[PDB]
């Protein structure tokens, strides 16, 4: 159960309106351009293509300019993963390249043959965020019952039994290694 | 037979529900309650029955639509404290 947050720094009036993200047990927040370049999408525009699904929308792109200004330092994949790894010698890349598979958006895939999925999805989140920031769509209703779940006997007993059975198979592992 | 459908709130967002099946039809009683005529046409669903918005405890309340809501709440609370046959055995 991981929680990804995409933060928009700089309120209405500030000039440093950059967009960063929070990755699982990684020290500091990472600029979104660095994330996209770490996923394989290196040049600009293509990132904006992954974010802004309408080239006519000049406002959204205008809002995306300082993000490009932010991630202008990193211009390739290797140094992007190197950046994330520096946060968290080449081992760090393999650390980084792991976080983008096992920890960064696990609900789509935890495999290794999927990078465009998480990239497009991240771009979708950016799109929603900016749509909310441009006053085109208001804040999400956190009291909406449709976006809530009721765990009954099933799921509860499922969690509990997963715990107890994992403890059991662990104990059995111990009795096994005892022999 | 596609006569009834299961709808959660999320899908409920995208539909138009008729309150009563008499809202599909194209000098009055002053006693009866005032009901706004259907200004909506494109219905996709109709309520089975509005009284199904209530739970088990509030379904015991006689004429809850003639009460102040906190009284319905209070009655809903006190219904669980009434005596009587809880089980035959």
């Amino acid at each position: 159960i991981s929680t990804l947050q995409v933060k928009l720094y700089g309120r209405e009036g500030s000039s440093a309106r950059t967009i960063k993200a929070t990755l699982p047990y990684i020290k500091q927040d990472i600029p979104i351009v660095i994330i996209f370049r770490a996923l394989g999408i290196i040049p600009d525009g293509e990132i904006l293509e992954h974010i802004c699904y309408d080239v006519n929308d000049w406002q959204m792109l205008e809002m995306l300019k300082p993000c490009v200004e932010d991630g202008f330092v990193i211009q390739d994949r290797e140094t992007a993963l190197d950046f994330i790894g520096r946060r968290g010698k080449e081992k760090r890349i393999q650390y980084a390249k792991d976080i983008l598979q096992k920890e960064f958006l696990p609900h789509i895939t935890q495999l290794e043959g999927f990078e465009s999925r998480k990239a497009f999805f991240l771009g979708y989140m950016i799109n929603r965020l900016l749509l909310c920031a441009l006053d085109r769509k208001d804040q999400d209703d956190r009291d909406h019952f449709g976006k809530k779940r009721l765990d009954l006997a099933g799921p509860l007993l499922a969690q509990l039994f997963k715990t107890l059975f994992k403890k059991l198979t662990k104990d059995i592992f111990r009795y096994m290694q005892r022999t | 037979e596609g006569l009834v459908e299961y709808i959660d709130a999320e899908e409920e967002e995208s539909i138009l529900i008729a309150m009563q099946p008499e809202d599909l039809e194209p000098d009055v009683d002053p006693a009866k309650r005032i009901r706004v005529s259907h200004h909506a046409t494109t219905f996709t669903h109709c309520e089975i029955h509005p009284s199904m918005i209530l739970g088990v405890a509030a379904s015991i309340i006689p004429f809850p639509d003639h009460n102040q809501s906190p009284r319905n709440t209070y009655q809903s609370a006190m219904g669980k404290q009434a005596m009587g046959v809880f089980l035959t055995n």
Binding site: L150, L152, A153 | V4, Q20, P21, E22, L24, I48, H49, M52, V56
Partner: peptide, 30 residues
């Protein structure tokens, strides 16, 4: 006939079709 539209009283026939199959504690059992 049998193609006429429902009234408002025939609704409780459908509600009776419900519960007769589901019961009152359906979510628990399911």
């Amino acid at each position: 006939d049998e193609s006429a539209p429902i009234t408002a009283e025939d609704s409780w026939a459908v509600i009776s079709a419900f519960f007769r199959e589901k019961g009152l504690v359906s979510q628990q059992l399911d």
